Design a protein around this nucleic acid. Structure first.
Lengths: 110, 107, 107, 66
RNA sequence: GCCGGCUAAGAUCAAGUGUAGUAUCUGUUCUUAUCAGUUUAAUAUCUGAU
């Protein structure tokens, strides 16, 4: 599936623009019964006309947001907001907070 | 014929706002779930008290209504609206759910 | 003396606070008061469970331990969400926590 | 008939409250436009399809002891 | 109200006065006790035995 997209940089990596897309897996609604989620990290190949499938970081909840929080991918999966960084094989959980009320269906970047 | 005060307090996922008298209702789980609202306001403190919140401390010792300075500091032409509608102070009271208790002002 | 007042205010009743030194309190008025006091607080501190607001209406041993365990630091607010992913490989391996990668990079 | 239909009273059961909740929450779905053109985008069905589904769900939704 | 208490913290029976309605006043008792049932959010109350 797919429910979010962003094009941000990474302070750890270089200035190469990196895209991060969300994906659901068996997110059957009515009744709400999802199976999993994933985040695909592309390198934005072709200077904007392609994308290299770098890493598919899994998650036990359907992600619904992504945004650069001071140079980090702030993804809100279910009821948990986690700030991830550049991962050679998967998005590293640089920080986490599970104090979301019911579902994180958005995020802002102040 | 109902869940005990501990069984009905451990089965729920938020016993921090559990009440002893609430466990004897007809649907304790439903009441516990409804009491777990995000930012609601529970029942007042006069649920079980039989003093009506006025008979106990019936000897009130304080002024009835102090004149606010937002309007006090032909009646007035260039200063009446220029002191009440111009030099007005915003009343800073409770925001959302400070339900008045019995005293609620002395403590 | 006031037997009618005793039956009205809630006299002729007690409450067994086992965690509060197995004390014997009064009626419902002292029932809740027995959970927030000096003797009950000292008993809870000597038992090992911290004095939490969720454990106010609790009055037992096994139940107190179950509350101190289940209501302890759950999965939420973990150990800072450790995710180091040291540069020992630069292309694979990220399960190293805040201490594993430190020891891997120190030596 | 139309005395107070829509809400119970002092000893209304939780199931009988949620039943009225869903039965009066779908009428705001079959009648309202934003909450009807928004559900036909998620389920990816036409207006008639979603409306007939919601109408058939009004038999005894929320989990009926029938 | 005064420095936990001095029984002005509650319920309830009979009578008087009066209103469209709410009410107002006088005189009691208050189980000092136990168990079972009804009931009350819990008391209380009532229903029976001792």
């Amino acid at each position: 599936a797919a429910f979010s997209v962003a094009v941000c940089r990474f302070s750890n990596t270089g200035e190469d623009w990196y895209v991060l897309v969300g994906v659901a897996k068996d997110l059957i609604l009515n009744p709400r019964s999802v199976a999993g989620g994933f985040v695909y990290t592309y390198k934005l190949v072709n200077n904007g006309e392609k994308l290299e499938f770098l890493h598919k970081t899994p998650v036990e909840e359907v992600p619904a947001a992504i945004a650069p929080f001071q140079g980090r991918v702030l993804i809100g999966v279910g009821k948990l907001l986690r700030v991830y960084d550049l991962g050679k094989k998967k998005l590293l959980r640089k920080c986490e907070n599970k104090h979301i009320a019911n579902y994180i269906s958005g995020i802002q970047t102040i | 014929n109902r869940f005990t005060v501990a069984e009905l307090k451990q089965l729920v996922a938020r016993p921090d706002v559990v009440e002893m008298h609430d466990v004897t209702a007809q649907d304790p789980k439903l009441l516990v779930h409804l009491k777990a609202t995000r930012n609601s306001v529970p029942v007042p403190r006069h649920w079980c008290f039989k003093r009506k919140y006025l008979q106990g401390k019936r000897g009130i010792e304080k002024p009835p209504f102090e004149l606010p300075d937002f309007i006090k500091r032909d009646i007035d032409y260039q200063k009446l609206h220029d002191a009440f509608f111009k030099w007005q102070t915003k009343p800073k009271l409770t925001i959302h759910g400070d339900l008045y208790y019995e005293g609620k002002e002395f403590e | 003396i006031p037997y009618w007042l005793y039956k009205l205010h809630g006299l002729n009743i007690n409450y067994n606070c086992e965690i509060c030194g197995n004390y014997t309190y009064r009626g419902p008025k002292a029932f809740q008061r027995h959970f927030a006091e000096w003797r009950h607080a000292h008993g809870m501190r000597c038992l090992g469970i911290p004095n939490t607001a969720h454990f106010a209406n609790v009055t037992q041993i096994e139940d107190a331990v179950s509350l101190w365990a289940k209501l302890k630091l759950q999965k939420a607010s973990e150990r800072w969400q450790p995710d180091t992913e040291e540069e020992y490989e630069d292309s694979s391996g990220n399960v190293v926590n805040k201490k594993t990668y430190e020891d891997l990079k120190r030596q | 008939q139309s005395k107070y239909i829509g809400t119970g009273h002092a000893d209304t059961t939780k199931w009988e409250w949620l039943v009225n909740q869903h039965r009066d929450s779908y009428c705001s779905y079959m009648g309202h436009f934003d909450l009807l053109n928004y559900f036909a985008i998620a389920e990816n069905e036409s207006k008639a399809r979603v409306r007939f589904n919601l109408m058939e769900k009004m038999l005894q939704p929320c989990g009926p002891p029938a």
